[PDB]
């Protein structure tokens, strides 16, 4: 069928850059990453197949540009969900949670860390479905069943775990769930607990003198706050695992309604 291989780039999604791509004939939309690391990213894209982890379609290569071709989300950033000083609905943010943790032991059953899990990362399809998105961070933990420790500094200050700037070696795992209890905060209180997670950060060190009458934590309710507490713990081998998260009371709480249905009367 000719021009289907044709796709017309309408709009920048992100400054390399992100366009939005059209198909000539279809009409199907894609999102193309132009790339001038990357040979890691396209490798990494290449081992996924989830619901919510962005969808790899292929790549191509003129010259020394890179085209990747990921499955585009209309919904656009999580954050963009976060009202500043406020956050969301509670019900919301626990469904985006729940959607969160099945990407993310997704990625670690097959030995993949994000290393940048923060909700500019976290991409809403036309159906409010979020997608685990960019892989240019991301690295193999496990190879033939063998864990490898980490030792690269990356992610974003806010979000990473407190080993990372402790620690020469730290497992990798765990630093993926701490980023996950930093993007469940902002859910649900719309501002970041801290600049980073370092003694010398007065905001952290009343974290760990449970001072939660303090700002974000005195917006959270009860029950997710108590997953907090599980979650933002310092020593990496203490804290709470994916597993154990699925099986936390908040986690569990009946809070949010399905889809709403087209309905009659009478
Ligand atoms: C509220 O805004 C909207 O409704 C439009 C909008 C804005 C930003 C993004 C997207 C859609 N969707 C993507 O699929 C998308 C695809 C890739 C990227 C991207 C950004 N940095 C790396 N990558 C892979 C960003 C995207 N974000």
Redesign the pocket.
């Known amino acids: 069928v000719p021009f289907v291989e044709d796709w017309d780039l309408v709009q920048t ?2 400054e390399g850059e ?1 366009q939005l791509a059209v198909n000539r004939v279809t009409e199907e939309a894609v ?1 193309v ?1 132009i790339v001038d690391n990357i040979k890691k990213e396209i490798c990494i894209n290449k081992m996924l197949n989830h619901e919510n982890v962005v969808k790899f379609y292929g790549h191509r290569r003129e010259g020394n540009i890179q085209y990747l071709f ?8 999580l954050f ?1 969900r976060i009202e500043p000083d406020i956050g969301m609905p509670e019900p919301d943010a626990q469904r985006f949670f729940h959607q969160l943790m099945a990407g993310v032991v997704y990625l670690h059953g097959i030995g993949i860390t994000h290393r940048d899990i923060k909700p500019e990362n976290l ?1 809403l399809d036309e159906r409010d479905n979020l997608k685990i ?2 892989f240019g961070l991301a690295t193999v933990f496990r190879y033939n069943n063998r864990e490898r420790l980490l030792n690269k500094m990356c992610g974003t200050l806010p979000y990473v775990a407190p080993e990372l700037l402790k620690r020469r070696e730290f497992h990798a795992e765990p630093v993926d769930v701490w980023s996950c209890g930093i993007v469940l905060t902002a859910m649900l209180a719309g501002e970041l607990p801290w600049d980073q997670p370092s003694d010398s950060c007065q905001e952290y060190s009343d974290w760990k003198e449970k001072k939660t009458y303090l700002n974000p934590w005195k917006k959270i309710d009860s029950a997710p706050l108590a997953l907090l507490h599980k979650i933002l713990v310092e020593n990496p081998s203490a804290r709470i695992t994916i597993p154990d998260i699925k099986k936390d009371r908040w986690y569990n709480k009946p809070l949010k309604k399905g889809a709403k249905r087209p309905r009659v009367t009478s």
């Open positions: 999604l992100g992100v999102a990453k990921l499955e585009y989300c209309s919904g656009g950033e963009d991409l998105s960019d």
